[PDB]
Write a protein that binds this ligand. Structure first.
Ligand SMILES: Nc1ncccc1NCc1ccccc1
Length: 377
C-alpha cells in the first residue's frame, strides 16, 4: 500500500482524481474519484477543456455494448455510448480488469475548464448506475475479477493543488491516528448512513434527528460542501450564527451568495464553532461523533480575480437530495468504505489541517436511543 499512498491529486473545488489506464495499449487518463455515483465514464471526444480523452479506435480490447446513456444533473449533463475495455490503475493494485466504460460523447457543465481530469469513477453501488443496475460498476468488476478485497479507503487532504490517497483493497494505518469508528451503510445504493445527532460547539440542535437524514445522508467525495437539508441548514446556521456572534456578516454569505474576507494572517478561527455529527454506530443504542473545525467549512476561494485579500466560502449549504458529507467532512478524516461489511469507518486523518487549540476528532462510544427512527422511508 506504500505504492498507493498519495495517488490522488486535484485543485481546490475541482475534486480529487486518480490516474487510470484504459484500453490496450493503455491510454492514461486522470479520473475523478466519486463515491456519490456508480458510473465509470471518460471523455471520448476532443472537448476543448480536456487534456486527454478516450480513443476507442486505438484500443484492440474495446467492445461496443451498442447502447447509450443519458445522465442529467442540475443543470449539468453528460451523454455517452456504453462499451467495455481493459482498465488498470498505475498507483493502485497490480491488476487489469474488464469494466464497463461510458464513452462521453456530449456533455453540459460536466467538465471543468481548468481541471486536469477527463472522466469520472463512480464508486457507489449498482442501484444508482445509469442506465440501470445491470451495468456493473467498476469496483464490483474489480473485486469480482480479482483477489482485491471488497473495500477501499480515502484520505483527502488539500494542502491550490490538493492531494490524497485512495488505498484500493485495504487500509493504510499510517494515514490516520487513534481508532476507526464505523457507521453502518444503511443501503447499498449511495453510501448512505444515518446521522443521529448534531451539535455545534457542544450544544445540540434538539431537532427531530429524522430531519438530519431527510431524505438521505450520504458520503460523497464528488461534492465539496457539507450539504444539510432545508430545515437542518436553517437551524445549524442560526446556531453557527449565534455561536459566532463576536462578529456579524451578510445574510448572503451564509447562503453561499457572497464571500467573506480578512487580511493575510488575520482570520479569527476561534470566533467559529466546531460541528459534530453523531453517526449511528455498529451496536444497538451506540453512536460516535465526528467533529470538524471551521478550517473545514470555511475554505479559501483560491484565486478571486477582483480581490488580493483572504476570502472564504461558507462551505455548508442547503439541499433537497439530502445531507451530503463532502470534502468539508472527508478532509477531516480517513474514511474506510468497508463494502465487505456494509459499513463506513471514520478516523481522525493524519493530514487534516488543525491548529494548536482544537483538532478534528472521532470519539465514542456514546449512548443514543432510537437511532433507527432517524432514517426516512
Ligand atoms: N457525486 C456527485 N455529487 C454531486 C453532483 C454530481 C456528482 N457526480 C457527478 C459529478 C460530475 C462532475 C463533477 C463532480 C461530480
Amino acid at each position: 500500500f506504500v505504492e498507493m499512498v498519495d495517488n490522488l491529486r486535484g485543485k481546490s473545488g475541482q475534486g480529487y482524481y486518480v490516474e487510470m489506464t484504459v484500453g490496450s495499449p493503455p491510454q492514461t487518463l486522470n479520473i475523478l474519484v466519486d463515491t456519490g455515483s456508480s458510473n465509470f465514464a471518460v471523455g471520448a471526444a476532443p472537448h476543448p477543456f480536456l487534456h486527454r480523452y478516450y480513443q476507442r479506435q486505438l484500443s484492440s480490447t474495446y467492445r461496443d455494448l451498442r447502447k447509450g446513456v443519458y445522465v442529467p444533473y442540475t443543470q449539468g449533463k453528460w451523454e455517452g455510448e456504453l462499451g467495455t475495455d481493459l482498465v488498470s490503475i498505475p498507483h493502485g493494485p497490480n491488476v487489469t480488469v474488464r469494466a464497463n466504460i461510458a464513452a462521453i460523447t456530449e456533455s453540459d457543465k460536466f467538465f471543468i475548464n481548468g481541471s486536469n481530469w477527463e472522466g469520472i469513477l463512480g464508486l457507489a453501488y449498482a442501484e444508482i448506475a445509469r442506465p440501470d443496475d445491470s451495468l456493473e460498476p467498476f469496483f464490483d468488476s474489480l473485486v469480482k475479477q480479482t483477489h482485491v478485497p471488497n473495500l477501499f479507503s480515502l484520505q483527502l487532504c488539500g494542502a491550490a493543488s490538493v492531494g490524497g490517497s485512495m488505498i484500493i483493497g485495504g487500509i493504510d494505518h499510517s494515514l490516520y491516528t487513534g481508532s476507526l469508528w464505523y457507521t453502518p451503510i444503511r443501503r447499498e445504493w449511495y453510501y448512505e448512513v444515518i446521522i443521529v445527532r448534531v451539535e455545534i460547539n457542544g450544544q445540540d440542535l434538539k431537532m427531530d434527528c429524522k430531519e438530519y437524514n431527510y431524505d438521505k445522508s450520504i458520503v460523497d467525495s464528488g461534492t465539496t460542501n457539507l450539504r444539510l437539508p432545508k430545515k437542518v441548514f436553517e437551524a445549524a446556521v442560526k446556531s453557527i450564527k449565534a455561536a459566532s456572534s463576536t462578529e456579524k456578516f451578510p445574510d448572503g454569505f451564509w447562503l453561499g451568495e457572497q464571500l467573506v474576507c480578512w487580511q493575510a494572517g488575520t482570520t479569527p478561527w476561534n470566533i467559529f464553532p466546531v460541528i459534530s455529527l453523531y453517526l449511528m454506530g455498529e451496536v444497538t443504542n451506540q453512536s460516535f461523533r465526528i467533529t470538524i473545525l471551521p478550517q473545514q467549512y470555511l475554505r479559501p476561494v483560491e484565486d478571486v480575480a477582483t480581490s488580493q485579500d483572504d476570502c472564504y466560502k461558507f462551505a455548508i449549504s442547503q439541499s433537497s437530495t439530502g445531507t451530503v458529507m463532502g470534502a468539508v467532512i472527508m478532509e477531516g478524516f480517513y474514511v474506510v468504505f468497508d463494502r465487505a461489511r456494509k459499513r463506513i469507518g471514520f478516523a481522525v486523518s493524519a493530514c487534516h489541517v488543525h491548529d494548536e487549540f482544537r483538532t478534528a476528532a472521532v470519539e465514542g462510544p456514546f449512548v443514543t436511543l432510537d437511532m433507527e427512527d432517524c432514517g426516512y422511508n
